[PDB]
Enzyme design. Structure first.
Site, PDB file in Angstrom:
ATOM      1  N   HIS A  62     -28.844 -24.418 -12.182  1.00 31.31           N
ATOM      2  CA  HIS A  62     -27.955 -23.732 -13.156  1.00 31.31           C
ATOM      3  C   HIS A  62     -26.885 -22.835 -12.461  1.00 31.31           C
ATOM      4  O   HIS A  62     -25.696 -23.112 -12.595  1.00 31.31           O
ATOM      5  CB  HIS A  62     -28.751 -22.912 -14.193  1.00 31.31           C
ATOM      6  CG  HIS A  62     -30.027 -23.565 -14.639  1.00 31.31           C
ATOM      7  ND1 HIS A  62     -31.229 -22.892 -14.687  1.00 31.31           N
ATOM      8  CD2 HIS A  62     -30.297 -24.841 -15.016  1.00 31.31           C
ATOM      9  CE1 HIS A  62     -32.184 -23.722 -15.070  1.00 31.31           C
ATOM     10  NE2 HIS A  62     -31.645 -24.911 -15.276  1.00 31.31           N
ATOM     11  N   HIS A  92     -24.159 -13.135 -12.472  1.00 34.46           N
ATOM     12  CA  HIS A  92     -23.959 -14.519 -12.048  1.00 34.46           C
ATOM     13  C   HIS A  92     -22.564 -14.988 -12.460  1.00 34.46           C
ATOM     14  O   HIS A  92     -21.860 -14.313 -13.210  1.00 34.46           O
ATOM     15  CB  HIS A  92     -25.000 -15.421 -12.703  1.00 34.46           C
ATOM     16  CG  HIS A  92     -24.969 -15.371 -14.200  1.00 34.46           C
ATOM     17  ND1 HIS A  92     -25.685 -14.471 -14.956  1.00 34.46           N
ATOM     18  CD2 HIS A  92     -24.231 -16.088 -15.084  1.00 34.46           C
ATOM     19  CE1 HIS A  92     -25.359 -14.654 -16.239  1.00 34.46           C
ATOM     20  NE2 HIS A  92     -24.479 -15.626 -16.368  1.00 34.46           N
ATOM     21  N   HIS A  94     -19.948 -18.642 -13.410  1.00 36.82           N
ATOM     22  CA  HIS A  94     -19.828 -19.991 -13.966  1.00 36.82           C
ATOM     23  C   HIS A  94     -18.493 -20.424 -13.308  1.00 36.82           C
ATOM     24  O   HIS A  94     -17.548 -19.619 -13.218  1.00 36.82           O
ATOM     25  CB  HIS A  94     -19.711 -19.975 -15.518  1.00 36.82           C
ATOM     26  CG  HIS A  94     -20.926 -19.433 -16.226  1.00 36.82           C
ATOM     27  ND1 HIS A  94     -21.971 -20.207 -16.678  1.00 36.82           N
ATOM     28  CD2 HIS A  94     -21.260 -18.157 -16.549  1.00 36.82           C
ATOM     29  CE1 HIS A  94     -22.894 -19.397 -17.246  1.00 36.82           C
ATOM     30  NE2 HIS A  94     -22.533 -18.129 -17.207  1.00 36.82           N
ATOM     31  N   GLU A 104     -16.024 -19.891 -19.210  1.00 40.35           N
ATOM     32  CA  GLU A 104     -16.730 -20.274 -20.426  1.00 40.35           C
ATOM     33  C   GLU A 104     -15.837 -19.851 -21.606  1.00 40.35           C
ATOM     34  O   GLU A 104     -15.553 -20.637 -22.505  1.00 40.35           O
ATOM     35  CB  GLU A 104     -18.106 -19.603 -20.480  1.00 40.35           C
ATOM     36  CG  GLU A 104     -19.022 -20.038 -19.343  1.00 40.35           C
ATOM     37  CD  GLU A 104     -20.486 -20.024 -19.710  1.00 40.35           C
ATOM     38  OE1 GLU A 104     -21.044 -18.945 -19.988  1.00 40.35           O
ATOM     39  OE2 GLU A 104     -21.084 -21.112 -19.712  1.00 40.35           O
ATOM     40  N   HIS A 117     -20.552 -12.792 -15.159  1.00 38.47           N
ATOM     41  CA  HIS A 117     -21.352 -12.223 -16.233  1.00 38.47           C
ATOM     42  C   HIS A 117     -22.258 -11.146 -15.677  1.00 38.47           C
ATOM     43  O   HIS A 117     -23.069 -11.417 -14.796  1.00 38.47           O
ATOM     44  CB  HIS A 117     -22.231 -13.292 -16.887  1.00 38.47           C
ATOM     45  CG  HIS A 117     -21.467 -14.321 -17.661  1.00 38.47           C
ATOM     46  ND1 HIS A 117     -22.049 -15.518 -18.059  1.00 38.47           N
ATOM     47  CD2 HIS A 117     -20.191 -14.261 -18.118  1.00 38.47           C
ATOM     48  CE1 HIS A 117     -21.106 -16.144 -18.745  1.00 38.47           C
ATOM     49  NE2 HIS A 117     -19.967 -15.425 -18.806  1.00 38.47           N
ATOM     50  N   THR A 196     -25.282 -18.129 -23.234  1.00 36.07           N
ATOM     51  CA  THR A 196     -24.555 -19.404 -23.165  1.00 36.07           C
ATOM     52  C   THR A 196     -25.351 -20.531 -22.513  1.00 36.07           C
ATOM     53  O   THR A 196     -24.806 -21.602 -22.242  1.00 36.07           O
ATOM     54  CB  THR A 196     -23.208 -19.250 -22.432  1.00 36.07           C
ATOM     55  OG1 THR A 196     -23.451 -18.857 -21.078  1.00 36.07           O
ATOM     56  CG2 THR A 196     -22.314 -18.202 -23.123  1.00 36.07           C
ATOM     57  N   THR A 197     -26.625 -20.262 -22.230  1.00 37.40           N
ATOM     58  CA  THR A 197     -27.526 -21.246 -21.646  1.00 37.40           C
ATOM     59  C   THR A 197     -28.863 -21.100 -22.392  1.00 37.40           C
ATOM     60  O   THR A 197     -29.142 -20.033 -22.980  1.00 37.40           O
ATOM     61  CB  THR A 197     -27.768 -20.982 -20.128  1.00 37.40           C
ATOM     62  OG1 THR A 197     -28.531 -19.780 -19.962  1.00 37.40           O
ATOM     63  CG2 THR A 197     -26.448 -20.840 -19.374  1.00 37.40           C
TER      64      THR A 197
HETATM   65  N1  LIG Z   1     -24.497 -17.131 -19.301  1.00 38.42           N
HETATM   66  S1  LIG Z   1     -25.189 -15.720 -19.989  1.00 38.42           S
HETATM   67  O1  LIG Z   1     -24.690 -14.426 -19.611  1.00 38.42           O
HETATM   68  O2  LIG Z   1     -25.324 -15.755 -21.472  1.00 38.42           O
HETATM   69  C1  LIG Z   1     -26.890 -15.457 -19.550  1.00 38.42           C
HETATM   70  C2  LIG Z   1     -27.390 -14.259 -19.054  1.00 38.42           C
HETATM   71  C3  LIG Z   1     -28.767 -14.146 -18.707  1.00 38.42           C
HETATM   72  C4  LIG Z   1     -29.646 -15.216 -18.850  1.00 38.42           C
HETATM   73  C5  LIG Z   1     -31.130 -15.140 -18.471  1.00 38.42           C
HETATM   74  O3  LIG Z   1     -31.557 -14.042 -17.994  1.00 38.42           O
HETATM   75  N2  LIG Z   1     -32.037 -16.293 -18.650  1.00 38.42           N
HETATM   76  C6  LIG Z   1     -33.449 -16.047 -18.795  1.00 38.42           C
HETATM   77  C7  LIG Z   1     -34.069 -15.969 -20.064  1.00 38.42           C
HETATM   78  C8  LIG Z   1     -35.356 -16.724 -20.293  1.00 38.42           C
HETATM   79  C9  LIG Z   1     -36.013 -16.651 -21.583  1.00 38.42           C
HETATM   80  C10 LIG Z   1     -35.417 -15.839 -22.671  1.00 38.42           C
HETATM   81  F1  LIG Z   1     -35.979 -15.778 -23.771  1.00 38.42           F
HETATM   82  C11 LIG Z   1     -34.154 -15.100 -22.449  1.00 38.42           C
HETATM   83  F2  LIG Z   1     -33.617 -14.359 -23.456  1.00 38.42           F
HETATM   84  C12 LIG Z   1     -33.450 -15.148 -21.139  1.00 38.42           C
HETATM   85  F3  LIG Z   1     -32.401 -14.526 -20.970  1.00 38.42           F
HETATM   86  C13 LIG Z   1     -29.149 -16.432 -19.361  1.00 38.42           C
HETATM   87  C14 LIG Z   1     -27.799 -16.580 -19.714  1.00 38.42           C
HETATM   88 ZN   LIG Z   2     -24.035 -16.070 -18.065  1.00 40.38          ZN
END
Ligand SMILES: NS(=O)(=O)c1ccc(C(=O)NCc2ccc(F)c(F)c2F)cc1
Ligand SMILES: [Zn+2]
Ligand SMILES: NS(=O)(=O)c1ccc(C(=O)NCc2ccc(F)c(F)c2F)cc1
Ligand SMILES: [Hg+2]
EC number: 4.2.1.1
Length: 258
Positions: A62, A92, A94, A104, A117, A196-197
């Site tokens: 990712h 991080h 993108h 994004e 981000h 966003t993921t």
């Molecule tokens: N591109 S972005 O800024 O939106 C983004 C920021 C943080 C995370 C993350 O910490 N993933 C782990 C994670 C794993 C399980 C969960 F339930 C979560 F909420 C969670 F953030 C993902 C996306």
């Molecule tokens: Zn992010």
């Protein structure tokens, strides 16, 4: 056998395991400058990153994350459209396979080469895990990266990527000052959204800065040499790890400037 950004498991397939992908407050979105509402009541942002403690850097497939110690209020965000204090936990990027894509969020359909981000969570909830169960649990500060001159404060990051080339690798990354990644101005647009993921939780207040930072083609080039794959699997370059803009629906994008 899990999400990615490839033809067979990319953004268009995410809805099958994560229904929320078709929700009402999904990110990212396109920022139409002529339609955002100037809200004079919006408070100025307060970035207090003087006691920030970076600890580690890791490639989790990712993207790559620089993690911070969030046991105490050492690096916080307040002000703006926020109520309460938000602790920085990680950051991080993108980016794309070419300079004309990577961000994004888009501004008037314009895509930038990359987007940073800076992820924060609401201290009111006690822990990160609780915060992701609340409508105002997280706050991510988005910053655009455009190709031009090199950004001094990004080089420390660029140099260590070689050691975390594949998924699962991490390296100690202490004493990194995140203040080196901010643009001069703190003017922004804000709107309620989601991660966003996957899992795509609609638990985020987005704060996107107007002024992009510039980075050299050489600096962005090094991002493009990372691998989605773990050691020993076929090489799959880490590029275009971005989700296309989502429909705004019942939302208003506010601007803190005119
Ligand atoms: N591109 S972005 O800024 O939106 C983004 C920021 C943080 C995370 C993350 O910490 N993933 C782990 C994670 C794993 C399980 C969960 F339930 C979560 F909420 C969670 F953030 C993902 C996306
Ligand atoms: Zn992010
Ligand atoms: N205190 S510490 O430095 O050891 C620490 C640093 C990072 C993370 C992490 O990234 N977990 C995922 C994660 C899960 C949910 C969220 F909301 C996030 F922002 C997020 F990063 C957890 C603890
Ligand atoms: Hg939530």
């Amino acid at each position: 056998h899990h999400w990615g950004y490839g033809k067979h498991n990319g953004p268009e397939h995410w809805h099958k395991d994560f229904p929320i992908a078709k929700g009402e407050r999904q990110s990212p979105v396109d920022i139409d400058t002529h339609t955002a509402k100037y809200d004079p009541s919006l408070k100025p942002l307060s970035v207090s990153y003087d006691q920030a403690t970076s600890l580690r850097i890791l490639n989790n497939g990712h993207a790559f994350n620089v993690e911070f110690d969030d046991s105490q209020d050492k690096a916080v965000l307040k002000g703006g459209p926020l109520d309460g204090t938000y602790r920085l936990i990680q950051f991080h990027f993108h980016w794309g396979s070419l300079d004309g894509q990577g961000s994004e969020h888009t501004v008037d359909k314009k895509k930038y080469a990359a987007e940073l981000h800076l992820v924060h969570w609401n201290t009111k909830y006690g822990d990160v895990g609780k915060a992701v169960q609340q409508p105002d649990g997280l706050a991510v500060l988005g910053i655009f990266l455009k190709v031009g001159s090199a950004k001094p404060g990004l080089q420390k990051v660029v140099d260590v990527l070689d050691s975390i080339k594949t998924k699962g690798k991490s390296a100690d990354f202490t004493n990194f000052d995140p203040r080196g990644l901010l643009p001069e101005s703190l003017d922004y647009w804000t709107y309620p959204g989601s991660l966003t993921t996957p899992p795509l939780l609609e638990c985020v207040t987005w704060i996107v800065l107007k002024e992009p930072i510039s980075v050299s083609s050489e600096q962005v080039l090094k991002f493009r040499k990372l691998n989605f794959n773990g050691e020993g699997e076929p090489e799959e370059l880490m590029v275009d790890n971005w989700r296309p803009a989502q429909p705004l629906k019942n939302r208003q994008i506010k601007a803190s400037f005119k």
